[PDB]
Design a protein around this ligand. Structure first.
Ligand SMILES: CC(C)CN(C[C@@H](O)[C@H](Cc1ccccc1)NC(=O)O[C@H]1CCOC1)S(=O)(=O)c1ccc(N)cc1
Lengths: 99, 99
Protein backbone atom coordinates (compact mmCIF):
# COMPACT_ATOMS: atom_id res chain seq x y z
CA UNK A 1 0.00 0.00 0.00
CA UNK A 2 0.91 3.66 -0.28
CA UNK A 3 0.19 5.65 2.85
CA UNK A 4 -0.08 9.40 2.71
CA UNK A 5 0.83 11.73 5.61
CA UNK A 6 -2.03 14.23 5.69
CA UNK A 7 -3.29 12.38 8.77
CA UNK A 8 -1.46 10.17 11.30
CA UNK A 9 -0.41 6.90 9.68
CA UNK A 10 -2.60 4.76 11.91
CA UNK A 11 -3.12 1.08 11.23
CA UNK A 12 -4.63 -1.99 12.79
CA UNK A 13 -2.21 -4.46 14.28
CA UNK A 14 -2.83 -7.91 15.66
CA UNK A 15 -0.82 -9.43 18.43
CA UNK A 16 -2.28 -12.52 20.04
CA UNK A 17 -6.04 -12.06 20.28
CA UNK A 18 -5.65 -8.33 20.66
CA UNK A 19 -6.31 -5.76 17.94
CA UNK A 20 -4.96 -2.22 18.43
CA UNK A 21 -4.53 0.97 16.41
CA UNK A 22 -0.87 1.97 15.95
CA UNK A 23 1.35 4.57 14.31
CA UNK A 24 3.68 3.61 11.50
CA UNK A 25 6.47 5.61 13.07
CA UNK A 26 9.73 6.02 11.12
CA UNK A 27 10.95 8.22 13.98
CA UNK A 28 10.80 5.35 16.48
CA UNK A 29 13.72 2.88 16.65
CA UNK A 30 11.63 0.24 18.44
CA UNK A 31 7.96 -0.76 18.70
CA UNK A 32 6.15 0.41 21.85
CA UNK A 33 2.62 -0.50 22.86
CA UNK A 34 0.45 0.45 25.82
CA UNK A 35 -0.35 -1.99 28.64
CA UNK A 36 -0.55 -5.64 27.74
CA UNK A 37 0.39 -8.83 29.56
CA UNK A 38 2.52 -10.67 27.01
CA UNK A 39 3.99 -14.13 27.65
CA UNK A 40 7.72 -14.83 27.94
CA UNK A 41 10.61 -13.17 29.73
CA UNK A 42 11.09 -9.41 29.59
CA UNK A 43 13.97 -7.06 30.42
CA UNK A 44 13.24 -3.61 31.84
CA UNK A 45 14.38 -0.75 29.67
CA UNK A 46 14.26 3.01 29.40
CA UNK A 47 13.43 4.88 26.23
CA UNK A 48 13.73 8.57 25.51
CA UNK A 49 11.16 10.77 23.84
CA UNK A 50 10.14 14.39 23.77
CA UNK A 51 9.78 15.34 27.41
CA UNK A 52 12.16 12.60 28.55
CA UNK A 53 12.26 8.90 29.32
CA UNK A 54 9.69 6.30 30.24
CA UNK A 55 10.26 2.82 31.63
CA UNK A 56 9.13 -0.07 29.46
CA UNK A 57 9.30 -3.88 29.45
CA UNK A 58 11.12 -5.42 26.47
CA UNK A 59 9.68 -8.66 25.06
CA UNK A 60 11.62 -10.44 22.30
CA UNK A 61 10.49 -12.57 19.32
CA UNK A 62 6.80 -11.57 19.56
CA UNK A 63 4.59 -12.29 16.54
CA UNK A 64 2.72 -9.21 15.25
CA UNK A 65 0.35 -8.95 12.25
CA UNK A 66 0.46 -5.57 10.54
CA UNK A 67 -1.88 -4.76 7.66
CA UNK A 68 -2.15 -8.50 7.00
CA UNK A 69 1.63 -8.99 7.24
CA UNK A 70 2.99 -11.45 9.79
CA UNK A 71 6.27 -10.28 11.30
CA UNK A 72 8.17 -11.18 14.47
CA UNK A 73 10.34 -9.14 16.84
CA UNK A 74 10.85 -7.08 19.98
CA UNK A 75 7.82 -5.31 21.47
CA UNK A 76 8.39 -2.75 24.18
CA UNK A 77 5.49 -2.46 26.61
CA UNK A 78 4.73 0.53 28.82
CA UNK A 79 2.92 3.88 29.27
CA UNK A 80 3.23 5.26 25.75
CA UNK A 81 0.40 7.72 25.00
CA UNK A 82 0.11 6.12 21.56
CA UNK A 83 0.82 2.65 20.18
CA UNK A 84 3.93 2.87 18.01
CA UNK A 85 5.23 0.61 15.29
CA UNK A 86 8.92 1.38 15.08
CA UNK A 87 11.58 0.67 12.50
CA UNK A 88 12.35 -2.75 14.02
CA UNK A 89 8.97 -3.96 12.67
CA UNK A 90 8.62 -1.59 9.69
CA UNK A 91 11.71 -3.07 8.05
CA UNK A 92 10.12 -6.52 8.31
CA UNK A 93 7.10 -5.44 6.23
CA UNK A 94 9.32 -3.82 3.58
CA UNK A 95 8.30 -0.29 4.52
CA UNK A 96 10.03 2.65 2.85
CA UNK A 97 9.73 6.43 2.87
CA UNK A 98 9.26 7.76 -0.66
CA UNK A 99 9.46 11.22 -2.24
CA UNK B 1 14.65 9.16 -2.89
CA UNK B 2 13.40 5.91 -1.45
CA UNK B 3 14.65 5.53 2.12
CA UNK B 4 14.77 2.22 3.96
CA UNK B 5 14.53 1.87 7.70
CA UNK B 6 17.31 -0.51 8.71
CA UNK B 7 18.91 2.76 9.83
CA UNK B 8 17.44 6.02 11.12
CA UNK B 9 16.02 8.08 8.25
CA UNK B 10 18.38 11.03 8.80
CA UNK B 11 18.70 13.68 6.07
CA UNK B 12 20.47 17.00 5.61
CA UNK B 13 18.24 20.07 5.69
CA UNK B 14 19.01 23.72 4.98
CA UNK B 15 17.33 26.40 7.02
CA UNK B 16 18.48 30.02 7.20
CA UNK B 17 21.73 29.22 5.41
CA UNK B 18 22.48 26.50 7.96
CA UNK B 19 22.96 22.81 7.30
CA UNK B 20 21.53 20.34 9.81
CA UNK B 21 20.79 16.64 10.21
CA UNK B 22 17.12 15.85 10.82
CA UNK B 23 15.03 12.72 11.24
CA UNK B 24 12.16 11.91 8.88
CA UNK B 25 9.55 11.08 11.47
CA UNK B 26 6.07 9.99 10.36
CA UNK B 27 5.00 9.74 14.04
CA UNK B 28 5.63 13.45 14.58
CA UNK B 29 2.70 15.69 13.60
CA UNK B 30 4.94 18.73 13.62
CA UNK B 31 8.52 19.69 12.84
CA UNK B 32 10.72 20.36 15.93
CA UNK B 33 14.33 21.55 15.70
CA UNK B 34 16.92 21.95 18.36
CA UNK B 35 17.54 25.32 19.95
CA UNK B 36 18.45 27.76 17.19
CA UNK B 37 17.78 31.37 16.31
CA UNK B 38 15.20 32.15 13.67
CA UNK B 39 13.89 35.58 12.74
CA UNK B 40 10.36 36.98 12.88
CA UNK B 41 7.79 36.85 15.64
CA UNK B 42 7.21 33.51 17.28
CA UNK B 43 4.47 32.18 19.54
CA UNK B 44 5.18 30.13 22.69
CA UNK B 45 3.57 26.67 22.49
CA UNK B 46 3.63 23.37 24.32
CA UNK B 47 3.87 20.05 22.52
CA UNK B 48 3.81 16.52 23.90
CA UNK B 49 5.52 13.26 23.13
CA UNK B 50 6.57 10.00 24.71
CA UNK B 51 7.90 11.41 27.99
CA UNK B 52 5.73 14.48 28.50
CA UNK B 53 5.44 18.01 27.19
CA UNK B 54 8.08 20.60 26.31
CA UNK B 55 8.02 24.32 25.61
CA UNK B 56 8.76 25.35 22.05
CA UNK B 57 8.77 28.56 20.03
CA UNK B 58 6.51 28.40 16.99
CA UNK B 59 7.75 30.02 13.79
CA UNK B 60 5.37 30.05 10.83
CA UNK B 61 5.97 30.13 7.06
CA UNK B 62 9.67 29.25 7.36
CA UNK B 63 11.52 28.13 4.24
CA UNK B 64 13.33 24.81 4.55
CA UNK B 65 15.07 22.66 1.97
CA UNK B 66 14.77 18.96 2.83
CA UNK B 67 17.22 17.15 0.62
CA UNK B 68 16.57 18.88 -2.71
CA UNK B 69 13.01 19.76 -1.87
CA UNK B 70 11.83 23.23 -0.85
CA UNK B 71 9.13 23.57 1.79
CA UNK B 72 7.64 26.63 3.52
CA UNK B 73 5.92 26.06 6.85
CA UNK B 74 5.79 25.80 10.61
CA UNK B 75 8.98 24.98 12.48
CA UNK B 76 8.89 24.65 16.25
CA UNK B 77 12.10 25.18 18.24
CA UNK B 78 13.05 23.74 21.64
CA UNK B 79 14.59 20.90 23.68
CA UNK B 80 13.88 18.02 21.31
CA UNK B 81 16.21 15.00 21.65
CA UNK B 82 16.83 15.22 17.90
CA UNK B 83 15.87 17.43 14.97
CA UNK B 84 12.54 16.18 13.70
CA UNK B 85 10.82 16.68 10.38
CA UNK B 86 7.12 15.93 11.03
CA UNK B 87 4.13 15.49 8.75
CA UNK B 88 3.50 19.22 8.24
CA UNK B 89 6.62 19.28 6.05
CA UNK B 90 6.72 15.62 4.99
CA UNK B 91 3.45 16.27 3.16
CA UNK B 92 4.95 19.35 1.43
CA UNK B 93 7.71 17.20 -0.12
CA UNK B 94 5.17 14.53 -1.24
CA UNK B 95 6.58 11.94 1.16
CA UNK B 96 4.65 8.68 1.57
CA UNK B 97 5.15 5.35 3.26
CA UNK B 98 5.08 2.36 1.00
CA UNK B 99 5.14 -1.35 1.64
C1 LIG C 1 11.24 11.73 19.07
C2 LIG C 1 11.73 10.56 18.24
C3 LIG C 1 13.25 10.63 18.09
C4 LIG C 1 11.29 9.23 18.88
N1 LIG C 1 9.84 9.28 19.17
C5 LIG C 1 9.01 8.84 18.04
C6 LIG C 1 8.17 10.03 17.57
O1 LIG C 1 7.62 9.71 16.29
C7 LIG C 1 7.03 10.39 18.52
C8 LIG C 1 5.93 9.32 18.52
C9 LIG C 1 4.81 9.80 19.42
C10 LIG C 1 3.63 10.28 18.86
C11 LIG C 1 2.62 10.75 19.69
C12 LIG C 1 2.77 10.72 21.07
C13 LIG C 1 3.95 10.23 21.62
C14 LIG C 1 4.97 9.77 20.79
N2 LIG C 1 6.46 11.68 18.13
C15 LIG C 1 6.59 12.82 18.80
O2 LIG C 1 7.32 13.04 19.75
O3 LIG C 1 5.65 13.83 18.33
C16 LIG C 1 5.97 15.19 18.58
C17 LIG C 1 7.26 15.60 17.91
C18 LIG C 1 6.89 16.78 17.04
O4 LIG C 1 5.48 16.79 16.89
C19 LIG C 1 4.88 16.02 17.93
S1 LIG C 1 9.50 8.49 20.54
O5 LIG C 1 8.08 8.30 20.65
O6 LIG C 1 9.87 9.33 21.65
C20 LIG C 1 10.18 7.02 20.62
C21 LIG C 1 11.46 6.77 21.13
C22 LIG C 1 11.95 5.47 21.19
C23 LIG C 1 11.17 4.41 20.74
N3 LIG C 1 11.61 3.13 20.75
C24 LIG C 1 9.90 4.64 20.26
C25 LIG C 1 9.42 5.93 20.21
Amino acid sequence: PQITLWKRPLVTIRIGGQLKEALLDTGADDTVLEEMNLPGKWKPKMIGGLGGFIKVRQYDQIPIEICGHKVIGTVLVGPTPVNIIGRNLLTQIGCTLNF
